[PDB]
Design a protein around this ligand. Sequence first.
Ligand SMILES: O=C(O)CNC(=O)Cn1c2c(c3cc(Br)ccc31)CC[C@@H](C(=O)O)C2
Ligand SMILES: [Ca+2]
Ligand SMILES: [Cl-]
Lengths: 366, 362
Amino acid sequence: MKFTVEREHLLKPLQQVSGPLGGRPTLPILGNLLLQVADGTLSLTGTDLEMEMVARVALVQPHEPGATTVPARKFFDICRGLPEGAEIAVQLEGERMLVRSGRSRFSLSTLPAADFPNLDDWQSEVEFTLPQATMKRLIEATQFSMAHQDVRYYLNGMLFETEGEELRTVATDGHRLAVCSMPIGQSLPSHSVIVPRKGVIELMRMLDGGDNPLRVQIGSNNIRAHVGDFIFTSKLVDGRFPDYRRVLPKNPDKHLEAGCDLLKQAFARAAILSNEKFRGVRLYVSENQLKITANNPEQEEAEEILDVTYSGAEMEIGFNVSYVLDVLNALKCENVRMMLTDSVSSVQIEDAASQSAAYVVMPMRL
Amino acid sequence: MKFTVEREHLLKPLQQVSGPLGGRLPILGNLLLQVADGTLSLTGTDLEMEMVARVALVQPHEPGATTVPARKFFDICRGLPEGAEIAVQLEGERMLVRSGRSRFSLSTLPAADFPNLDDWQSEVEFTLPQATMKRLIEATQFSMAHQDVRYYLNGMLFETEGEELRTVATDGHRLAVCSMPIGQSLPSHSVIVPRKGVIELMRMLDGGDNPLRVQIGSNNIRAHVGDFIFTSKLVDGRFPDYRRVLPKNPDKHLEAGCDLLKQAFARAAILSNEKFRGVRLYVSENQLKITANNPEQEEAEEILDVTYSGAEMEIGFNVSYVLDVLNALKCENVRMMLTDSVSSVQIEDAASQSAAYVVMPM
Ligand SMILES: O=C(O)CNC(=O)Cn1c2c(c3cc(Br)ccc31)CC[C@@H](C(=O)O)C2
Ligand SMILES: [Ca+2]
Ligand SMILES: [Cl-]
């Protein structure tokens, strides 16, 4: 095995294929990357047995076929640590891989490519293509609401839902919910899967904001994403996801609109004197005005008054201010819409200018 | 107690005094506020050191003192919009804070409960530019010990000699010294400033033209810059003599680009022992070679061009120490000054003798 390649053509691929690798593997070879020279192409693969990322690099300098595995962290650090515009010559010499460039030489330990574990083979039964940016928006809009290591394992992940011509993402930790729907211009079957949170992050981070389209394949227990030179594959979470349609407030008739930043800064100051554990704040809403109050066990008190667009009936309601701020921070828009009903119902939050993303927070009594 | 001040004027003072404060005596988690003689005084302390900020009151105000949670009060002010005006007043056991239509009511502890550092006398005084103090601390800070049982090493020596103010920091494995002339005839004297004080001292240098005034007593140091007064206790014990650590006659002079050299050591370090982190250097005429290897039999090798005349030698180092030096230097070229394979090495900016770094071999 032999190749010579520019440092810069190796770094992005190394970032991508390093993502999956867990910090304390059950096998020695799981700390390594698989390297293959074949048909004019170097492929790198990293895995953790749950998910896998393969990157491809075209080889325009002379090369010799073969495969081996090297420690991922070290080989990445060497390449990244080498100077800008460097040529990186790699060759397999016995049970060592030789890396050199200019007058820097490294000898890396190998494990055999034959021991590198592959993911279970599977069949695609739902496929579609879409702009990278559409996938990026779907995930960014909802990712923060995924559970982290809940015992309800199916919440530690994101629901991907196909219906008609749109793709929808949903996330919830059992307390707050985020949903986002985008049309993708392909007739799709009605289908639903749960991607594990680590898989969702790899996917998100494999999208480089560029013009390459993203192709998605979904099987019974697996999902795969292909964009340009990168192919990501992950297991699905085998569980049942809650129905998001049930939590959405029915016919909220009291819509409040305000500048996202102004509402955010007001909640952010009020939060300073909220309960540190339960983070409850009170909204008093009246004609074109909102008053926000907070207090903590030490009886310190905050109050914020802003001008808003609001014409409905006067009402009160409490919320977890961290959840509201998470929503306002994910939105990053000019104007926000808060769709209110009463003191005992939940609230749905959106960009004033767009219904594509919706967020649901529970009422707090105080 | 009442005052009304613009956010811009309150923010940096708050930031400075509040920065290092924790609960502990919960009142150590509070700032002392005093309105007196047209001035708002904001004071913070952990009993070892103290930061006092004065700010002029150009609007109507009323005298009096209280104590509020430092973090919450800073966060509130910081969270207010740019150009905002902040009206503060005492009412009951609470401190009211009003800006626009944002209102806040904070808890208080009595100003009488707020502790003072003991009185002391100045024995040594001088002034210097901020930029000089910044440079003196920056050059050496990373070589202080952190939590060594030799308490005298967890901190920085400040020495006056002739016209020079000098800083020294060592942890027993490596050492940094930096001397700067400050245009004054100084008495021969030294004190040890605790690392926490070093950091606050550093952080009080805004980067403006206000000079610094320093006062040293037998158990205290103080620095005035602009409207801030930092006061800290000193550390007991006999600090080592940097001249004993410096090599006596490092005849062998090596010269290389600092970034190039730093890059090589860093790459080589990848394949060094994870615990020891040793690298070998082989010096020969106009050439430096760096090698590293680990238990797994993995090997790194780097070869650079340098300006070296003198005998060939081999010497081992912990790479992180060499990297800390090379990153502290921030220069074009570095001089490596050597004696032999079992003796300390000295490292300087090739273009300045103003700072020197010493590292032991492995
Ligand atoms: O601190 C160590 O790990 C042991 N170092 C020495 O035995 C020699 N030594 C010391 C110091 C030192 C500093 C350097 Br660069 C090299 C060897 C050194 C500074 C602190 C000194 C003290 O104990 O007061 C000792
Ligand atoms: Ca340069
Ligand atoms: Cl010096």
